[PDB]
Amino acid sequence: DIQTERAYQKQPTIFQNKKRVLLGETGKEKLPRYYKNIGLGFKTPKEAIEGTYIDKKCPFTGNVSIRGRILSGVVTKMKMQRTIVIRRDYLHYIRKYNRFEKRHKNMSVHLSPCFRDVQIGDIVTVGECRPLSKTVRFNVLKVTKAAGTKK
Amino acid sequence: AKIVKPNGEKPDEFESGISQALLELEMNSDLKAQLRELNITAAKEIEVGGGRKAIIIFVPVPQLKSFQKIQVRLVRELEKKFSGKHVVFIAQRRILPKPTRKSKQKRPRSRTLTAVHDAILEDLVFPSEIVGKRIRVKLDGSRLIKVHLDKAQQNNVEHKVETFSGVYKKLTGKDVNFEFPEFQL
Amino acid sequence: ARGPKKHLKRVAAPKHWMLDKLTGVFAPRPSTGPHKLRECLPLIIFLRNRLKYALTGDEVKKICMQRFIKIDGKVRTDITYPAGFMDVISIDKTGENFRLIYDTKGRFAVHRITPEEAKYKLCKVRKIFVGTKGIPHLVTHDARTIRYPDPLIKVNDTIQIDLETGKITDFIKFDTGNLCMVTGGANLGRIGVITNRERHPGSFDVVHVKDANGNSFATRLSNIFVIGKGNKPWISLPRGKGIRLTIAEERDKRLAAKQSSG
Amino acid sequence: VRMNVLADALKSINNAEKRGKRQVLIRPCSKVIVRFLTVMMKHGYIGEFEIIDDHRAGKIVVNLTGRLNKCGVISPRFDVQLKDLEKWQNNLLPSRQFGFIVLTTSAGIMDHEEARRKHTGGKILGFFF
Amino acid sequence: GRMHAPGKGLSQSALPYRRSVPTWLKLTSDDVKEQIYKLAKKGLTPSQIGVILRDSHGVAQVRFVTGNKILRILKSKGLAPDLPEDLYHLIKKAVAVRKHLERNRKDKDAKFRLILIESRIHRLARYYKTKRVLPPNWKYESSTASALV
RNA sequence: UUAAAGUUGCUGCAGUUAAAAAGCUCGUAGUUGGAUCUUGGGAGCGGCCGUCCCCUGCUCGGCGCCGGCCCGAAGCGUUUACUUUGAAAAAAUUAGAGUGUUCAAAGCAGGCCGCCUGGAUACCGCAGCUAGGAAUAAUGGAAUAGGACCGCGGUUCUAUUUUGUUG
């Protein structure tokens, strides 16, 4: 499932190549995991702790720093791999005609693979990080489900 | 004894005496087979404007329909064992506050305060079913509800409308008057 | 541009430098120093427009080549040396010392001090640095690197240095209930007591300072400055004692003084 | 369809006072309608009214006097502040000595002098003079 | 007025303000529930169940003699139809007008009414997709018209 | 080019006959959407009423006492708009304080016989941060009950002041 690619994927902090004694079972073949806390009152999911995936652009299990602005939005498409696109909606004011303006603009957000129950139409909270690509400047921190889906 | 409270506290002298009085009232009558599971929760003693008194008796909701068809008798064994104390039956109901954003199940709309007040008013007197309701809002800003009752069984309710107004002003606080319309039926 | 900016116009100057508008096209840009470009007071404008010792910009550089002006006890020959907040200016010839404390309005004001007050100077530490082989360092707001303080020094608390040796004598802990100085922004030059501090993670923290007469205001945490333990200061306050009285009360006291003077 | 019960209510009471009637019926009810007539009743522009408590939506029998001139509704409910209320009062009241602006603030629904006293703003409903 | 007609009609029921069980009714809730179960095993739409119960058994409404409405008991027992009543009748009317229009190619009025029936079917389908009653993949076509009764 | 122009009308225009309702209907985007969820008082004050105190809950510690009372805190309570306050928001220009450039446009000076001082204040559309209210408008619960509380039964890793110096 992992290392389906010509370049090896590994975490650059945990040394996985220590010396073993009995060279078998009974307390071994359990890889240690590296994680960290983002802060700002956020919670690290257990799927990023007990997970097995390798991703350097993950905010929790990776070399990604979170600072700056905190936003929110609703997703539209999951087509490109490991990055999603969300839609943000806001009300603009016009000074001449004393009314309001509903407009939108969308942005590309990197999605960590620790969320696997994500679907169309749920409100997600994103955070500012480093420029990871040309159009990618945000990362997914927590996911709140949409209205309904009781079963 | 016959009194059962939802909370573990000891009742006073008055409601214990009313529970005992109804205990011999169901003992000496032919209704002992019809009150085996029918109990009392709480009772009070308040006053009405004038030279009369009143008593209120609380009944739980899922046994209320048992007491609806026995109330037409039970009240006048209570005035034939008392001197002149008029006896009414009401159904108890818990009230919940509106959940604000400053402060969990969704509160069902049966616990709505206006619905509780409406249920208290309609179940306060059973045989005179309500056929009309108007609200007088006088120039001081206060509300004065007037409630129209049934044309039938008028004679055995008209002597207790002052007691109904007194107990509704005591439990809730609304000036409620009663009228008997004759136009419709 | 193609490099660093080097000139400075008259109206590009900050308002607290507070010059006129028609005497030239250029204003004195200060040289690089311990303070920022915006909140500093150059030597040339001070000697030319505050004490009125000199009238022309060649006379002040003649003073600086005559070696009569010392900032923090060392002779400064720079004519545009930025003398910022909480600095002592000592003149060896006439024998008076000046300390720059903001008054009740947003500008620098003269404050004649005793020589016994003129041997120390307060500083605010910006960050704590641990050195090569575990040397505790200092980063003050006046760019003074001090080695090995007392180990109770934190990010926000202020220190007292001795001008001759450059070492800590005593420090004031940043707690709620200490005397306050505000430097920067709108509320600039008000004496009060720190009451409440709230933490905002990911953004700037804001404090709440209550003045002696009961007035309260809020400033950012980066623009705070502690001057005293409790309500007792460690320096000499200027006139007015940092109140920021309203313009109606200022009008009342000005008309009362004018009526009494006659 | 019916998209604003309050505009229809105030139009109906305006037509009733313009013809010269004494009692009128308003087909729907709302809490905001009862607050609006409570403001005009406290200010003495309408008489003592009633609520026909029927199980659909209350019908309101308002006693009409000759003290009313015009009742109007601004649609939609425009946001108004303390600094922007004077323009509304200038171009919408007939005079500075009488007339009231009914605006919904967070502390209830009442006239604009009381909201000036409590220093609060909100959304405008209508006017009467 | 109407939704695809110029008429403005006022003809519907008017339930009284009184909301109590009358004294002449000598029935319980379980008896009328059993009657609903038997008449639903007879296989009839819930509206006409209400018609027959009101006509024969003297009950005004089930919801004033039982604490809940008739389709809710029909779903609680587990014999309510999967498709709603009005949607099923609209699809049946669409099937009828399409079967009429196969043998009559020149009936333009029937084609216009078929357009109106299809529009009302779509507008009800949007609401039933919104309220999570019907699956999102259910689509209305002519070829699925005869397949879905 | 602006006002005049209510002849570009958001405030604030007109469409039977003067300029102007698509031949008619369906229909996606857009805009707008019925009613209803907590109402009422108390101890006071001046001769029925204005202002004011009250109708949010579980791990640490000081205005105070003899493990018991209360108060205060590192940490938490559905989110939006709107409403009010606070921070930051360059100067000049605009309003505007003081001031006999002979007055004034201008300037920031100047006045007392070494001294006293000014060189303010306000606005800065929207968007971003923060704290009081929840009226107004939209979103949500629990209904095929894995619904909310309460004491009881098991599947795994570990807190060392707690099994005499050491396996």
Short mmCIF file of N, CA and C in Angstrom, two decimals, chain C residues 46-96:
data_model
loop_
_atom_site.label_atom_id
_atom_site.label_comp_id
_atom_site.label_asym_id
_atom_site.label_seq_id
_atom_site.Cartn_x
_atom_site.Cartn_y
_atom_site.Cartn_z
N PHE C 46 17.25 68.43 18.71
CA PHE C 46 17.17 68.70 20.14
C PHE C 46 17.93 69.97 20.50
N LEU C 47 19.19 70.05 20.07
CA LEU C 47 20.00 71.23 20.38
C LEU C 47 19.56 72.46 19.60
N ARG C 48 18.93 72.28 18.43
CA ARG C 48 18.54 73.43 17.63
C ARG C 48 17.16 73.96 17.98
N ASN C 49 16.24 73.12 18.47
CA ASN C 49 14.86 73.51 18.62
C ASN C 49 14.28 73.29 20.01
N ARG C 50 15.02 72.71 20.95
CA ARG C 50 14.47 72.51 22.29
C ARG C 50 15.16 73.36 23.34
N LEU C 51 16.48 73.25 23.48
CA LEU C 51 17.21 74.09 24.41
C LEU C 51 17.58 75.44 23.81
N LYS C 52 17.43 75.59 22.49
CA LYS C 52 17.77 76.80 21.73
C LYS C 52 19.23 77.22 21.92
N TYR C 53 20.11 76.24 22.08
CA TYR C 53 21.53 76.55 22.27
C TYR C 53 22.16 77.01 20.97
N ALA C 54 21.77 76.41 19.85
CA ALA C 54 22.31 76.74 18.55
C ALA C 54 21.19 77.02 17.56
N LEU C 55 21.47 77.88 16.58
CA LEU C 55 20.48 78.30 15.61
C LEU C 55 20.61 77.60 14.26
N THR C 56 21.80 77.12 13.91
CA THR C 56 22.11 76.69 12.56
C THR C 56 22.77 75.32 12.62
N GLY C 57 22.60 74.53 11.55
CA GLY C 57 23.06 73.15 11.56
C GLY C 57 24.57 72.97 11.54
N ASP C 58 25.32 74.04 11.30
CA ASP C 58 26.77 73.94 11.43
C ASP C 58 27.21 74.17 12.87
N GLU C 59 26.41 74.90 13.65
CA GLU C 59 26.77 75.16 15.04
C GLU C 59 26.67 73.90 15.88
N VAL C 60 25.66 73.06 15.62
CA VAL C 60 25.50 71.82 16.38
C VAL C 60 26.61 70.82 16.05
N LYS C 61 27.08 70.78 14.80
CA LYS C 61 28.22 69.90 14.51
C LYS C 61 29.51 70.49 15.06
N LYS C 62 29.59 71.82 15.21
CA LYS C 62 30.71 72.42 15.94
C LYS C 62 30.69 72.01 17.41
N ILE C 63 29.49 71.94 18.00
CA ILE C 63 29.35 71.43 19.37
C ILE C 63 29.80 69.97 19.45
N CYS C 64 29.39 69.16 18.48
CA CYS C 64 29.72 67.74 18.50
C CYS C 64 31.21 67.49 18.25
N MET C 65 31.87 68.34 17.46
CA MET C 65 33.33 68.29 17.37
C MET C 65 34.02 68.91 18.57
N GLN C 66 33.31 69.71 19.37
CA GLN C 66 33.90 70.26 20.58
C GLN C 66 33.83 69.27 21.75
N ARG C 67 33.15 68.13 21.56
CA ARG C 67 33.08 67.01 22.51
C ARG C 67 32.48 67.43 23.85
N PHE C 68 31.27 67.97 23.78
CA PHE C 68 30.55 68.41 24.96
C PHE C 68 29.29 67.61 25.26
N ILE C 69 28.82 66.79 24.32
CA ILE C 69 27.57 66.05 24.48
C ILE C 69 27.89 64.57 24.66
N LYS C 70 27.35 63.98 25.72
CA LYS C 70 27.47 62.55 25.96
C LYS C 70 26.08 61.93 26.05
N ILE C 71 25.86 60.86 25.29
CA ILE C 71 24.64 60.06 25.38
C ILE C 71 25.01 58.75 26.04
N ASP C 72 24.37 58.45 27.18
CA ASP C 72 24.66 57.30 28.04
C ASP C 72 26.13 57.28 28.48
N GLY C 73 26.67 58.46 28.79
CA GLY C 73 27.98 58.57 29.39
C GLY C 73 29.16 58.43 28.45
N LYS C 74 28.93 58.31 27.15
CA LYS C 74 30.01 58.23 26.18
C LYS C 74 29.87 59.37 25.19
N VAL C 75 31.00 59.98 24.84
CA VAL C 75 31.04 61.14 23.95
C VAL C 75 30.63 60.71 22.55
N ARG C 76 29.58 61.34 22.02
CA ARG C 76 29.06 61.02 20.70
C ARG C 76 29.35 62.19 19.77
N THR C 77 30.16 61.95 18.75
CA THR C 77 30.48 62.95 17.74
C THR C 77 29.52 62.92 16.56
N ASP C 78 28.56 62.00 16.56
CA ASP C 78 27.60 61.93 15.46
C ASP C 78 26.54 63.00 15.62
N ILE C 79 26.31 63.76 14.54
CA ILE C 79 25.36 64.86 14.61
C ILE C 79 23.91 64.37 14.52
N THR C 80 23.66 63.26 13.85
CA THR C 80 22.32 62.69 13.70
C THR C 80 22.22 61.37 14.44
N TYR C 81 22.81 61.31 15.63
CA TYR C 81 22.72 60.11 16.46
C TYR C 81 21.33 60.02 17.06
N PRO C 82 20.61 58.91 16.87
CA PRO C 82 19.23 58.82 17.38
C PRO C 82 19.20 58.57 18.88
N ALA C 83 18.84 59.60 19.64
CA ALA C 83 18.64 59.48 21.08
C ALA C 83 17.16 59.24 21.33
N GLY C 84 16.81 58.00 21.63
CA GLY C 84 15.43 57.58 21.76
C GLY C 84 14.89 57.71 23.16
N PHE C 85 13.89 56.88 23.46
CA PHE C 85 13.28 56.87 24.78
C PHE C 85 14.25 56.30 25.82
N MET C 86 14.11 56.79 27.06
CA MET C 86 14.75 56.24 28.25
C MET C 86 16.27 56.38 28.16
N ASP C 87 16.73 57.50 27.60
CA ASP C 87 18.14 57.79 27.42
C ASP C 87 18.54 59.01 28.25
N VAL C 88 19.79 59.00 28.70
CA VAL C 88 20.35 60.09 29.50
C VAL C 88 21.36 60.84 28.64
N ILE C 89 21.19 62.16 28.55
CA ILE C 89 22.10 63.04 27.82
C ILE C 89 22.83 63.90 28.83
N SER C 90 24.15 63.76 28.89
CA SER C 90 24.98 64.45 29.88
C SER C 90 25.91 65.42 29.18
N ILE C 91 25.96 66.65 29.69
CA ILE C 91 26.83 67.69 29.16
C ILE C 91 27.87 67.99 30.24
N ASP C 92 29.15 67.83 29.90
CA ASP C 92 30.20 68.00 30.89
C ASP C 92 30.54 69.46 31.15
N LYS C 93 30.28 70.35 30.19
CA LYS C 93 30.69 71.74 30.35
C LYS C 93 29.73 72.50 31.26
N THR C 94 28.47 72.60 30.86
CA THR C 94 27.50 73.35 31.65
C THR C 94 27.08 72.61 32.91
N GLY C 95 27.09 71.28 32.87
CA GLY C 95 26.84 70.49 34.06
C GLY C 95 25.38 70.22 34.36
N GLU C 96 24.61 69.86 33.34
CA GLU C 96 23.23 69.44 33.53
C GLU C 96 22.97 68.20 32.70
#
